[PDB]
From a paper:
The ATPase activity and crystallographic localization of BDE-100 in the Pgp mutants were compared with those of a parent C952A mutant control as a basis for measuring changes in Pgp function and shifts in ligand-binding modes, respectively. All structures were determined in the 3.98–4.17 Å resolution range and adopted the same inward-facing conformation as wild-type Pgp. The ligand occupancies for site 1 were in the range 0.5–0.6. Furthermore, we detected no significant differences in the binding pose of BDE-100 in site 1 between the Y303A, Y306A, C952A or F979A mutants. Not surprisingly, the corresponding mutations of mouse Pgp used in this work were each still competent in verapamil-stimulated ATP hydrolysis, albeit with differences in ATPase kinetics. Increasing concentrations of BDE-100 alone did not increase the basal ATPase activity for wild-type Pgp, the C952A control or any of the five aromatic replacement mutations.
The structures highlight a high concentration of aromatic residues in the transmembrane α-helices that form the DBP, many of which are directly engaged in contacts with ligands. The binding mode of the environmental pollutant BDE-100 in the DBP of Pgp was also previously captured by XRC and it was shown to be a potent inhibitor of verapamil-stimulated ATPase activity of the transporter.
Numbering used by the authors: 30 to 626, 689 to 1273
Write the structure that this text describes.
Amino acid sequence: KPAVSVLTMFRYAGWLDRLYMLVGTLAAIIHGVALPLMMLIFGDMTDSFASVGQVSKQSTQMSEADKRAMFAKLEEEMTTYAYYYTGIGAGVLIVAYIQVSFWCLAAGRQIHKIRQKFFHAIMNQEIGWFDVHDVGELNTRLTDDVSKINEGIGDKIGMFFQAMATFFGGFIIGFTRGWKLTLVILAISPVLGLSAGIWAKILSSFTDKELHAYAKAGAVAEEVLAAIRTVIAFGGQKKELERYNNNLEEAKRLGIKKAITANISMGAAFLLIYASYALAFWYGTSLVISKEYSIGQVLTVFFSVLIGAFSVGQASPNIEAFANARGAAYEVFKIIDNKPSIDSFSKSGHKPDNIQGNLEFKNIHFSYPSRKEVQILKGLNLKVKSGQTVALVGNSGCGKSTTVQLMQRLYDPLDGMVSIDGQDIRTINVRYLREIIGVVSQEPVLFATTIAENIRYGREDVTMDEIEKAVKEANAYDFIMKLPHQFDTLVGERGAQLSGGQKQRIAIARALVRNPKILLLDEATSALDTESEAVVQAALDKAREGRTTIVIAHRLSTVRNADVIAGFDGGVIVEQGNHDELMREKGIYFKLVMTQTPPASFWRILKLNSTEWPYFVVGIFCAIINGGLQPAFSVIFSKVVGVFTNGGPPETQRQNSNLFSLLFLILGIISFITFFLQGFTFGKAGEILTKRLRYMVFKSMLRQDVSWFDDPKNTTGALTTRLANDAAQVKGATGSRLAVIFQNIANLGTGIIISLIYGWQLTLLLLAIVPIIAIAGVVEMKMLSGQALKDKKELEGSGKIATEAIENFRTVVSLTREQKFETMYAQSLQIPYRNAMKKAHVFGITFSFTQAMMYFSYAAAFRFGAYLVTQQLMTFENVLLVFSAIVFGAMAVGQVSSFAPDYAKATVSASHIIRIIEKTPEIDSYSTQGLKPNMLEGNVQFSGVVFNYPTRPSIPVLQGLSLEVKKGQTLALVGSSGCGKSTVVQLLERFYDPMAGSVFLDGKEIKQLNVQWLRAQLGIVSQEPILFDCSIAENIAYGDNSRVVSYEEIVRAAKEANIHQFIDSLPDKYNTRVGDKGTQLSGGQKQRIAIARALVRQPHILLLDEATSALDTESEKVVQEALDKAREGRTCIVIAHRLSTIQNADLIVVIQNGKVKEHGTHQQLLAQKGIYFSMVSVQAGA
Ligand SMILES: Brc1ccc(Oc2c(Br)cc(Br)cc2Br)c(Br)c1
């Protein structure tokens, strides 16, 4: 919404930039006017053949005389028009270079200025300015918004004025050469602007419907793929597939309905657009039979008006480009023009010499740019004598640090003054102020250069002698000499990451070259290892005694040797003096001392598409028809002008033009009959394979074992995204692009035969001409993208040192040296600048030479056309036919290069979608093999089980584990921490097979058992029960699949789980919907339902994985009261973290390091005094 004044945006154009834009936009208007003149001459060449085509047919008496006066008219006329044509092509050769080169010159020159000025302004902002903005957004604003300005002040403006020139020049030649046809072509323009306006309404309303259609199927997939371990546990893998398949049937029906309506929209749109042209050209013939216009003039205005009418649309993007460039220049010029109060670039203020360093803070009230919400200093008083070292202490608030901020004049105080020596800090130059103040902060930062360069950021003029003395005087010399490369080592966020106390000493040496008169030490010793602390503290004490120092820390070890100590309480200075005196004061200071003591040939995706052997052949056949049917419209146009230039007797003409105009309206309805079929057939054929793909993909996804969904590469979001993209892309590869790529090769294929057989070698010329200008247009775009990628590579090096500059900026401004980054960034930009000058000459040459090859080509179209072919018996009516046939057959192949990324984008989406079907798991739930034993009672054997999770094969969770539980017994399971408690349940569910050892149930190894049958006698109940969006009756009936569960049977389970209080209390009862979509209810109810569905199954084994994890108050008392009833009649394994409820367990087992450590009944393990005795004592006391 905000924009910029049109002059202020070009504020950096002067002298030459103003001239380049003028000569550029001048030649840009010359370039535009050339094309309607190029069509003006096309009309005069018609009358030349027309004055001869009418007299050649008017004879029927003399033949050698028609070889004289006729051919003489031609060679004087044709060579006159051919001379003009070659001149127009030489004209656009020059002006197109002048056009694009100059504007890209003016843009390149300005954008170089924008950048330097804009980064300059970023570094000139006071710290209170950054405290309210994001440096991340600002940096991205620096590289993106400057790019948008370049796009709007570049060759796009020259293009804008080229288009308006064709618009004006088109309707000038339109109006002047005839005021009737123009008003007629403008009358059908509302119809053309109304037919394309139906597409802005159908697309935007149906692209939502499809995004609302699959959103109903993707919602099923997401609660499934998020609750996958619950559907795997209960084996709903057939239902959740079926339910996803039931939503795929509706999206197919809504996709075929969209395919019906959208293809009706295109065909009727073209047929209205092509009828609107017909009537404008038929009614152009109706005015030549009346002898008002010539057959040549009808062509001139008809083209010049349509050319001029369509230049309106070819300019609208450049308007938007210039407009986006204005609005983007707002927030950028806003920074450049914003003048600060502090500067730090200002060359003003006093530079006191012989600074003794007597500092005082008087009545300083202050607040950070959070402003009225918080006031951190409620007045202040604090001197510090020269040479002394004051120490600031405080419990919280850190108004301690605030005095360091103010002393650097980072912010000015709200009320009061900070006085270095006798002068207010605000009289002294801000730069000289920060040069006479060294700073050592809590987090040290070193810039991505050498040690000598980081030390050189203290002073730019320095010799390794003084670097050596500085690092040696901050005892930081002994420890870099051992480090290789000596002073030439690297530092940064990338490479050679050093110790904290090591990084601080380089900062002290950096501040030591500064030889400052003032010293500010904020938190420098805090947050650092204890041993290297003393090494740095030795340097801090050696960095003082020659200076006056204010120090802030929480280490009460560095404060004793301070001459004076200051304490705060609510921003108020409260307690000051020497160490011994504050201890006698027994106040705030004393109170704190005691406290601290792969692209490839994928044929099979088409082989799966071969499920529909028809539907394609219906479309292909129907597309080649429409392909062959499309040059015939040019053949009709050739003969509507042909027989009416080759007329002779004018009486038979009016009756044939009526017959031709009737044919084309029959030929367009049969084109709309054949266009609708080629779209509907692929539309239906593409939507039905989208079901087959998404069906087969979602199937093989439920096939994979838990080992695959734990992969951080495959999350629930990344799987539905992989589910929707890969199936939509392959539809596009086999969809519209294929119908169009076969329509167009039939378009040229049928047009190449018609033209070839009329004009002998006439067509053989254009086939030496057209493929060259098409290749020349493609190599231009390859050079376009090459210059684009190369410039991105070398401006990000500039923005990389800008990134380092602006998000490490509160440090650099403390060090001054903004002029450093100022110059580095300037040297960084000098390469893309001198590059952008070549870009102007490159773009200008390529564009001018793809434009010249269009007019020189069309100069050669009439070079054969006349002279060598017209001195022969071959006719004019065929030269017009070959021009329209070949050039339009060529521009139809120009659609092949546009649909190229649609093929590759799908093959890569196909690359992943064929792999995801064929990938087989270690533990496939689908295998029907397995024992399916007959005996009911259930035991459980773990025997020497070692197992690590495949995601993290580092820390073992189970190693040498061995358990056993009898039927009807409760096996408690206590663990120090981790999933060692929980991994047991996962292995009994055979989520994974163990690495070593084995797990048995009824005496049989589950690893040889049926995977699905095993999970069928297991009553899993987790700590967060997930319930799908459907009836609670179904959430409860979900526990027993392969059979619909009776109402009174899911009632009996709801009776067991003690959830039946709600299940009658709700208005819908069992038919109520849960899933945070229909109704919401707390976890205690969610949980009981999970218990309900757990024992619908009537398992022989319950599995209670910390079932009282997230639960409170009476809700825990009622859930355990249900769990305790659900067991005792079944084999039970409970790992619940409530050891109170675990007392009445038939066997408790303590897990230690994966090994079983301590087992026995409660009082047994309680008689022993060890881990279980401590596990129970720690929770009972606390
Ligand atoms: Br009759 C008649 C035939 C083609 C005409 O222009 C064309 C041409 Br030329 C090519 C195609 Br494809 C469609 C149309 Br509409 C006109 Br205007 C009138």
